[PDB]
Amino acid sequence: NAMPMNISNTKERILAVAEALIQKDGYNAFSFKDIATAINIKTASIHYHFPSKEDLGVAVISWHTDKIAAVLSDISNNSSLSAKEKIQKFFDAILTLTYNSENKMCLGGMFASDFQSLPVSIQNQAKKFFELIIEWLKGVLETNGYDNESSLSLAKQIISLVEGGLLLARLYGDETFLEGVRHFIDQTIK
Amino acid sequence: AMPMNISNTKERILAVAEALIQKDGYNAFSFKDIATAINIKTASIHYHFPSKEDLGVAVISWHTDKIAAVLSDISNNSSLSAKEKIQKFFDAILTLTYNSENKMCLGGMFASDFQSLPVSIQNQAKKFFELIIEWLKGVLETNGYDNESSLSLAKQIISLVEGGLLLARLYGDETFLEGVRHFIDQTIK
Numbered sequence: 001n002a003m004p005m006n007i008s009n010t011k012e013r014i015l016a017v018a019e020a021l022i023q024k025d026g027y028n029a030f031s032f033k034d035i036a037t038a039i040n041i042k043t044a045s046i047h048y049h050f051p052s053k054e055d056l057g058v059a060v061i062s063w064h065t066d067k068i069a070a071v072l073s074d075i076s077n078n079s080s081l082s083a084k085e086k087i088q089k090f091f092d093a094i095l096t097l098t099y100n101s102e103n104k105m106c107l108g109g110m111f112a113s114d115f116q117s118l119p120v121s122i123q124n125q126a127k128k129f130f131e132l133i134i135e136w137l138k139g140v141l142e143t144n145g146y147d148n149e150s151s152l153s154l155a156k157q158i159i160s161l162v163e164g165g166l167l168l169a170r171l172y173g174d175e176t177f178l179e180g181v182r183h184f185i186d187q188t189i190k
Numbered sequence: 191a192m193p194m195n196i197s198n199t200k201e202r203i204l205a206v207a208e209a210l211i212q213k214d215g216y217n218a219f220s221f222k223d224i225a226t227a228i229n230i231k232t233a234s235i236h237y238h239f240p241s242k243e244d245l246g247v248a249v250i251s252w253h254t255d256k257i258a259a260v261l262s263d264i265s266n267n268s269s270l271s272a273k274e275k276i277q278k279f280f281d282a283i284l285t286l287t288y289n290s291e292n293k294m295c296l297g298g299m300f301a302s303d304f305q306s307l308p309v310s311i312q313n314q315a316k317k318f319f320e321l322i323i324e325w326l327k328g329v330l331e332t333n334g335y336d337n338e339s340s341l342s343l344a345k346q347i348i349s350l351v352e353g354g355l356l357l358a359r360l361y362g363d364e365t366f367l368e369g370v371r372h373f374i375d376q377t378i379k
């Protein structure tokens with residue numbers, strides 16, 4: 001029956017806005033003060049949950065990866081979808097989280113661009129994000145009858161194209177960069 | 191007896207700025223980083239570039255000119271087929287990026303940072319990609335592609351180049367870059 005009220009706690013609201021800021025502007029272009037101002041809490045309440053910016057960075061990527069893992073799991077466990085349809089829906093899921101949501105970039109892509117400036121803890125979480133995506137893509141493609149080598153190569157082309165397509169689409173509002181990703185999928189996969 | 195081949199202060203500032211941006215990104219370097227790198231006073235940097243934005247604009251403009259000259263040498267090379275021109279383009283990019291101390295594309299770096307940048311720098315970054323996309327489109331049109339397909343394929347190629355470079359440099363996985371070449375080789379006739 002009655003559940004607890006659906007109010008986001010302070011930690012969750014910090015994570016959600018940090019995620020948004022990183023996706024829009026990049027890790028080296030937001031501060032705790034930006035978050036405090038955005039959701040009207042004390043900057044000291046941010047330091048409370050995340051003593052350093054690094055702590056928040058690690059936690060944001062970890063949370064985001066968990067969310068994407070669930071989304072992907074739901075696609076690959078859908079028995080009515082062909083392998084090709086799973087890849088198509090993967091791209092739709094990325095669009096929902098990126099270009100469609102206030103012209104955001106992929107969180108992973110943003111950290112990849114900033115990689116050399118990041119603490120190692122964040123670097124390692126960013127690598128984990130891509131490893132999860134690539135493994136998921138490779139696995140789906142293996143169910144389509146592709147051999148191991150071809151599955152890994154195509155998985156890497158697909159994520160490269162997704163990242164580069166999003167990067168360029170969001171500069172111009174030029175959807176054709178994103179259409180190109182879909183065209184590659186549709187023309188390359190069986 | 192020619193003048194001696196010494197890079198002037200402005201030239202060395204631009205070169206080190208370009209490298210810092212390609213390694214770490216525009217929002218992760220300062221003039222102090224440049225001063226420490228080449229042992230000049232920060233006041234000397236401001237002399238040439240009063241604000242960081244002025245340096246950002248100059249670096250992209252200069253980098254774009256360098257890429258334009260490279261692309262010109264490729265397309266005036268008559269021994270190269272259209273496909274070979276695109277292969278050699280990606281080889282030129284590799285020289286300036288992955289091969290040079292694991293750097294990212296300067297344009298790609300500014301694209302990632304775009305929302306945080308002054309409009310002057312946004313516009314320079316767009317000019318960089320317009321130059322590349324137009325050049326690729328033109329090579330493809332010499333191979334018989336129509337306007338819409340030339341443009342679509344050029345945008346796929348640069349999208350894949352940018353993404354491949356982005357991911358290859360995270361842990362030295364060459365196969366991300368092999369994938370770019372495979373796409374070029376398998377798609378262009």
Ligand code: NA
Pocket residue numbers: 026110113114215299302303
């Ligand atoms: Na960036």
